[PDB]
Amino acid sequence: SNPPPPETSNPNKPKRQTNQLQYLLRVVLKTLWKHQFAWPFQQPVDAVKLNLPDYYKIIKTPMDMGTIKKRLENNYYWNAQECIQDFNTMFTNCYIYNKPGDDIVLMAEALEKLFLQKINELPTEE
Ligand SMILES: CN1C[C@@H](c2ccc(S(=O)(=O)N3CCCCC3)cc2)CC1=O
């Protein structure tokens, strides 16, 4: 079976609004979400529907952009680095589970190159 998705809200986790987190939602996530390669990454890997029975035997820290989007919308993150770490987990999982040269890996690599450009332009904390 699929595991439960990663937590996207938590009543005990403190909250704040920052210009860097707003940039991650309004610029970084927005750009990646609408990219033509985004769709396999817009929700948790459904190993049942995709017929990937070993996926969660190999990947123990799943992550996807649907989860990241909810975390940003729900004010789950305290700082930008927590969000950046989640994007990197998503990319790394893809590179670990799949083989170099697979189309899904090429898609992830393209999304990551775009992501790193946008993070290079992260605004300073106000
Ligand atoms: C992040 N993920 C998602 C999982 C997934 C696998 C295959 C398909 S696919 O067969 O639809 N297709 C493959 C070729 C490139 C476009 C998508 C979708 C999702 C695997 C993975 O590491």
PDB file of C-alpha atoms and ligand atoms in Angstrom:
ATOM      1  CA  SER A   1       0.000   0.000   0.000  1.00  0.00           C
ATOM      2  CA  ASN A   2       0.889   3.679  -0.247  1.00  0.00           C
ATOM      3  CA  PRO A   3       2.030   5.348   2.981  1.00  0.00           C
ATOM      4  CA  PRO A   4       0.147   8.355   4.309  1.00  0.00           C
ATOM      5  CA  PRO A   5       1.337  11.550   2.609  1.00  0.00           C
ATOM      6  CA  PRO A   6       3.839  13.833   4.349  1.00  0.00           C
ATOM      7  CA  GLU A   7       2.332  16.146   6.949  1.00  0.00           C
ATOM      8  CA  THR A   8       1.226  19.480   5.462  1.00  0.00           C
ATOM      9  CA  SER A   9      -0.134  21.113   8.621  1.00  0.00           C
ATOM     10  CA  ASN A  10       0.567  20.738  12.300  1.00  0.00           C
ATOM     11  CA  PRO A  11      -1.154  22.506  15.209  1.00  0.00           C
ATOM     12  CA  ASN A  12       2.053  22.548  17.290  1.00  0.00           C
ATOM     13  CA  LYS A  13       4.361  24.081  14.655  1.00  0.00           C
ATOM     14  CA  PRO A  14       4.820  27.879  14.973  1.00  0.00           C
ATOM     15  CA  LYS A  15       3.895  30.153  12.071  1.00  0.00           C
ATOM     16  CA  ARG A  16       5.120  33.313  10.391  1.00  0.00           C
ATOM     17  CA  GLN A  17       4.995  35.220   7.106  1.00  0.00           C
ATOM     18  CA  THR A  18       8.261  36.287   5.459  1.00  0.00           C
ATOM     19  CA  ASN A  19       9.109  37.803   2.106  1.00  0.00           C
ATOM     20  CA  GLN A  20      11.363  34.830   1.295  1.00  0.00           C
ATOM     21  CA  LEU A  21       8.561  32.339   1.900  1.00  0.00           C
ATOM     22  CA  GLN A  22       6.212  34.514  -0.156  1.00  0.00           C
ATOM     23  CA  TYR A  23       8.784  34.452  -2.979  1.00  0.00           C
ATOM     24  CA  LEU A  24       9.019  30.668  -2.764  1.00  0.00           C
ATOM     25  CA  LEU A  25       5.256  30.389  -3.265  1.00  0.00           C
ATOM     26  CA  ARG A  26       4.596  33.240  -5.712  1.00  0.00           C
ATOM     27  CA  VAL A  27       7.708  32.873  -7.915  1.00  0.00           C
ATOM     28  CA  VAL A  28       9.577  29.603  -7.375  1.00  0.00           C
ATOM     29  CA  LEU A  29       6.699  27.160  -6.884  1.00  0.00           C
ATOM     30  CA  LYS A  30       4.498  29.012  -9.386  1.00  0.00           C
ATOM     31  CA  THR A  31       7.158  28.764 -12.109  1.00  0.00           C
ATOM     32  CA  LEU A  32       7.854  25.077 -11.499  1.00  0.00           C
ATOM     33  CA  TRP A  33       4.197  24.094 -11.056  1.00  0.00           C
ATOM     34  CA  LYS A  34       3.139  25.329 -14.510  1.00  0.00           C
ATOM     35  CA  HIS A  35       6.182  23.925 -16.348  1.00  0.00           C
ATOM     36  CA  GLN A  36       5.370  21.231 -18.903  1.00  0.00           C
ATOM     37  CA  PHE A  37       7.430  18.694 -16.882  1.00  0.00           C
ATOM     38  CA  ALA A  38       5.690  19.417 -13.554  1.00  0.00           C
ATOM     39  CA  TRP A  39       2.821  16.947 -13.678  1.00  0.00           C
ATOM     40  CA  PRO A  40       4.508  13.706 -12.407  1.00  0.00           C
ATOM     41  CA  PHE A  41       5.721  15.768  -9.429  1.00  0.00           C
ATOM     42  CA  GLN A  42       2.453  17.542  -8.513  1.00  0.00           C
ATOM     43  CA  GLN A  43       1.289  14.861  -6.027  1.00  0.00           C
ATOM     44  CA  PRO A  44       2.737  12.033  -3.906  1.00  0.00           C
ATOM     45  CA  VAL A  45       3.968   9.039  -5.890  1.00  0.00           C
ATOM     46  CA  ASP A  46       0.959   6.693  -6.082  1.00  0.00           C
ATOM     47  CA  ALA A  47       2.843   3.416  -6.206  1.00  0.00           C
ATOM     48  CA  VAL A  48      -0.387   1.429  -6.448  1.00  0.00           C
ATOM     49  CA  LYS A  49      -1.846   3.266  -9.445  1.00  0.00           C
ATOM     50  CA  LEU A  50       1.558   3.618 -11.142  1.00  0.00           C
ATOM     51  CA  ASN A  51       2.365  -0.092 -10.542  1.00  0.00           C
ATOM     52  CA  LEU A  52       5.605   0.687  -8.659  1.00  0.00           C
ATOM     53  CA  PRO A  53       5.338  -1.847  -5.817  1.00  0.00           C
ATOM     54  CA  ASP A  54       8.928  -1.311  -4.639  1.00  0.00           C
ATOM     55  CA  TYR A  55       8.809   2.502  -4.569  1.00  0.00           C
ATOM     56  CA  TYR A  56       8.293   2.877  -0.820  1.00  0.00           C
ATOM     57  CA  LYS A  57      10.649   0.008  -0.062  1.00  0.00           C
ATOM     58  CA  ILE A  58      13.384   2.210  -1.569  1.00  0.00           C
ATOM     59  CA  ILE A  59      12.212   5.782  -0.841  1.00  0.00           C
ATOM     60  CA  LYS A  60      11.623   6.400   2.884  1.00  0.00           C
ATOM     61  CA  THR A  61      11.452  10.228   2.792  1.00  0.00           C
ATOM     62  CA  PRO A  62       8.927  10.934   0.022  1.00  0.00           C
ATOM     63  CA  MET A  63       8.345  14.460  -1.215  1.00  0.00           C
ATOM     64  CA  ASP A  64       6.482  16.150  -4.055  1.00  0.00           C
ATOM     65  CA  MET A  65       5.421  19.620  -5.185  1.00  0.00           C
ATOM     66  CA  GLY A  66       1.795  19.104  -4.137  1.00  0.00           C
ATOM     67  CA  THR A  67       3.031  18.647  -0.565  1.00  0.00           C
ATOM     68  CA  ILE A  68       5.385  21.620  -0.851  1.00  0.00           C
ATOM     69  CA  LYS A  69       2.526  23.773  -2.218  1.00  0.00           C
ATOM     70  CA  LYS A  70       0.257  22.834   0.693  1.00  0.00           C
ATOM     71  CA  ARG A  71       3.064  23.481   3.183  1.00  0.00           C
ATOM     72  CA  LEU A  72       3.580  26.978   1.776  1.00  0.00           C
ATOM     73  CA  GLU A  73      -0.172  27.700   1.619  1.00  0.00           C
ATOM     74  CA  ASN A  74      -0.689  26.374   5.160  1.00  0.00           C
ATOM     75  CA  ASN A  75       2.248  28.357   6.648  1.00  0.00           C
ATOM     76  CA  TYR A  76       3.917  25.102   7.695  1.00  0.00           C
ATOM     77  CA  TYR A  77       7.475  26.352   7.152  1.00  0.00           C
ATOM     78  CA  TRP A  78       9.286  28.718   9.492  1.00  0.00           C
ATOM     79  CA  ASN A  79      12.065  29.547   7.016  1.00  0.00           C
ATOM     80  CA  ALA A  80      13.015  29.260   3.365  1.00  0.00           C
ATOM     81  CA  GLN A  81      15.669  26.599   3.932  1.00  0.00           C
ATOM     82  CA  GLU A  82      13.047  24.094   5.113  1.00  0.00           C
ATOM     83  CA  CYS A  83      11.247  24.555   1.793  1.00  0.00           C
ATOM     84  CA  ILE A  84      14.462  24.366  -0.261  1.00  0.00           C
ATOM     85  CA  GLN A  85      15.331  21.146   1.564  1.00  0.00           C
ATOM     86  CA  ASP A  86      11.982  19.659   0.507  1.00  0.00           C
ATOM     87  CA  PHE A  87      12.559  20.484  -3.171  1.00  0.00           C
ATOM     88  CA  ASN A  88      15.962  18.817  -2.936  1.00  0.00           C
ATOM     89  CA  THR A  89      14.456  15.708  -1.339  1.00  0.00           C
ATOM     90  CA  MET A  90      11.979  15.478  -4.227  1.00  0.00           C
ATOM     91  CA  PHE A  91      14.750  15.692  -6.826  1.00  0.00           C
ATOM     92  CA  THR A  92      17.074  13.293  -4.968  1.00  0.00           C
ATOM     93  CA  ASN A  93      14.323  10.679  -4.574  1.00  0.00           C
ATOM     94  CA  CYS A  94      13.748  10.783  -8.332  1.00  0.00           C
ATOM     95  CA  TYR A  95      17.464  10.300  -9.052  1.00  0.00           C
ATOM     96  CA  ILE A  96      17.753   7.413  -6.557  1.00  0.00           C
ATOM     97  CA  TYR A  97      14.697   5.416  -7.616  1.00  0.00           C
ATOM     98  CA  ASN A  98      15.133   5.838 -11.381  1.00  0.00           C
ATOM     99  CA  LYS A  99      18.035   5.300 -13.797  1.00  0.00           C
ATOM    100  CA  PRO A 100      20.110   8.104 -15.369  1.00  0.00           C
ATOM    101  CA  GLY A 101      18.759   8.910 -18.794  1.00  0.00           C
ATOM    102  CA  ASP A 102      15.168   7.933 -17.994  1.00  0.00           C
ATOM    103  CA  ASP A 103      12.693  10.540 -19.197  1.00  0.00           C
ATOM    104  CA  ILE A 104      11.437  11.120 -15.643  1.00  0.00           C
ATOM    105  CA  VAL A 105      15.025  11.887 -14.550  1.00  0.00           C
ATOM    106  CA  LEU A 106      15.525  14.285 -17.467  1.00  0.00           C
ATOM    107  CA  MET A 107      12.303  16.030 -16.390  1.00  0.00           C
ATOM    108  CA  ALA A 108      13.507  16.331 -12.790  1.00  0.00           C
ATOM    109  CA  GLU A 109      16.901  17.627 -13.954  1.00  0.00           C
ATOM    110  CA  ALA A 110      15.198  20.337 -16.023  1.00  0.00           C
ATOM    111  CA  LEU A 111      12.995  21.356 -13.097  1.00  0.00           C
ATOM    112  CA  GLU A 112      16.012  21.411 -10.777  1.00  0.00           C
ATOM    113  CA  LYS A 113      18.036  23.630 -13.115  1.00  0.00           C
ATOM    114  CA  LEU A 114      15.139  26.104 -13.172  1.00  0.00           C
ATOM    115  CA  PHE A 115      14.725  25.831  -9.401  1.00  0.00           C
ATOM    116  CA  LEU A 116      18.384  26.614  -8.748  1.00  0.00           C
ATOM    117  CA  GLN A 117      18.214  29.721 -10.953  1.00  0.00           C
ATOM    118  CA  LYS A 118      15.213  31.018  -8.996  1.00  0.00           C
ATOM    119  CA  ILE A 119      16.894  30.298  -5.645  1.00  0.00           C
ATOM    120  CA  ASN A 120      20.009  32.118  -6.860  1.00  0.00           C
ATOM    121  CA  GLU A 121      17.682  35.151  -7.111  1.00  0.00           C
ATOM    122  CA  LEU A 122      16.133  34.749  -3.637  1.00  0.00           C
ATOM    123  CA  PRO A 123      15.487  38.229  -2.155  1.00  0.00           C
ATOM    124  CA  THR A 124      17.120  39.326   1.082  1.00  0.00           C
ATOM    125  CA  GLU A 125      15.075  39.034   4.271  1.00  0.00           C
ATOM    126  CA  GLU A 126      13.207  42.258   4.998  1.00  0.00           C
TER     127      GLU A 126
HETATM  128  C1  LIG B   1       8.486  11.336  -9.127  1.00  0.00           C
HETATM  129  N1  LIG B   1       8.073  10.098  -9.743  1.00  0.00           N
HETATM  130  C2  LIG B   1       6.769   9.797 -10.319  1.00  0.00           C
HETATM  131  C3  LIG B   1       6.703   8.296 -10.684  1.00  0.00           C
HETATM  132  C4  LIG B   1       6.166   8.193 -12.053  1.00  0.00           C
HETATM  133  C5  LIG B   1       6.653   7.268 -12.948  1.00  0.00           C
HETATM  134  C6  LIG B   1       6.166   7.207 -14.266  1.00  0.00           C
HETATM  135  C7  LIG B   1       5.159   8.050 -14.766  1.00  0.00           C
HETATM  136  S1  LIG B   1       4.642   8.012 -16.387  1.00  0.00           S
HETATM  137  O1  LIG B   1       4.778   6.674 -16.865  1.00  0.00           O
HETATM  138  O2  LIG B   1       3.383   8.675 -16.481  1.00  0.00           O
HETATM  139  N2  LIG B   1       5.735   8.931 -17.181  1.00  0.00           N
HETATM  140  C8  LIG B   1       7.117   8.421 -17.334  1.00  0.00           C
HETATM  141  C9  LIG B   1       7.947   9.185 -18.341  1.00  0.00           C
HETATM  142  C10 LIG B   1       8.072  10.647 -17.976  1.00  0.00           C
HETATM  143  C11 LIG B   1       6.694  11.239 -17.754  1.00  0.00           C
HETATM  144  C12 LIG B   1       5.878  10.400 -16.771  1.00  0.00           C
HETATM  145  C13 LIG B   1       4.707   8.994 -13.843  1.00  0.00           C
HETATM  146  C14 LIG B   1       5.185   9.063 -12.535  1.00  0.00           C
HETATM  147  C15 LIG B   1       8.191   7.866 -10.556  1.00  0.00           C
HETATM  148  C16 LIG B   1       8.957   8.995  -9.845  1.00  0.00           C
HETATM  149  O3  LIG B   1      10.091   9.010  -9.444  1.00  0.00           O
END
